[PDB]
Amino acid sequence: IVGGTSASAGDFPFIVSISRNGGPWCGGSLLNANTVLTAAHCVSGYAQSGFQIRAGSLSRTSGGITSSLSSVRVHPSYSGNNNDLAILKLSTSIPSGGNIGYARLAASGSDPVAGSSATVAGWGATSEGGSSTPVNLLKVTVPIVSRATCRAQYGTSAITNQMFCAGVSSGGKDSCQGDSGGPIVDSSNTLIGAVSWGNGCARPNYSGVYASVGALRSFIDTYA
């Protein structure tokens, strides 16, 4: 997260950190005791044995409850930047309670409205290409950017109806490398997306791009 602040205990109670080969990798959202939602690009094409999830801790390295993966399912239309969600099934169930909870999801057919406030969180770098990643969770608040504006930034075909955008025009606030897969929530605390892609991080005139839960809800519901 670039331009963010420290999360407090009990913020984002559904968030999980996801390590790969013992090192930082991405974020995700706990949907229920045995299911995590992340970005497809975090898991597609990699050995599943490399991953570990951690829930219930501000730290990505210690505390909380861990699990390995039992299975991975990517959206059936995932390709590159598009339809960038995956469902992970956990080998060890994680109960809600204390600083662990489950996400509430945006409705099928919903789309975030331009100018509304959203909050994104993760353990990614605090600068593009950053040489070290924080141990403790960060968060930042950014407004939704209309799909039309985002298409003017990236190209018409580049931003699909399964993506939405968020950021500040002058830059400075964004999700970054290592934040992929983690949650972006709306002003009701409903999970509206997962960190997906962008042109660098926090650049003026290049919004962060997020996979839309509303748009991909039927997939989520099938496998959650």
Swiss-Prot record:
Record protein name field: Trypsin
Domain spans labelled Peptidase S1: 1-224
Annotated S-S bridges: C26-C42, C150-C165, C176-C201
Record has Protein biosynthesis as a keyword: no
Active site: H41 (charge relay system), D84 (charge relay system), S180 (charge relay system)
Family to which this protein belongs: Belongs to the peptidase S1 family.
Site-annotated residues for Required for specificity: D174
InterPro entries xref list: Peptidase_S1, Peptidase_S1_PA, Peptidase_S1_PA_chymotrypsin, Peptidase_S1A, Trypsin_dom, TRYPSIN_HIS, TRYPSIN_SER
SUPFAM superfamilies: Trypsin-like serine proteases
Subcellular compartments: Secreted
UniProt keyword list: Disulfide bond, Hydrolase, Protease, Secreted, Serine protease, Signal, Zymogen
GO MF terms held by the record: serine-type endopeptidase activity
DNA-binding is among the record's keywords: no
Catalysed conversion reaction: Preferential cleavage: Arg-|-Xaa, Lys-|-Xaa
Xref: PANTHER family: FI18310P1-RELATED, POLYSERASE-RELATED
Enzyme Commission identifier(s): 3.4.21.4
Cross-referenced Pfam families: Trypsin
Single GO BP term: proteolysis
Top EC class, one word: hydrolase
One of the record's GO cellular component terms: extracellular region
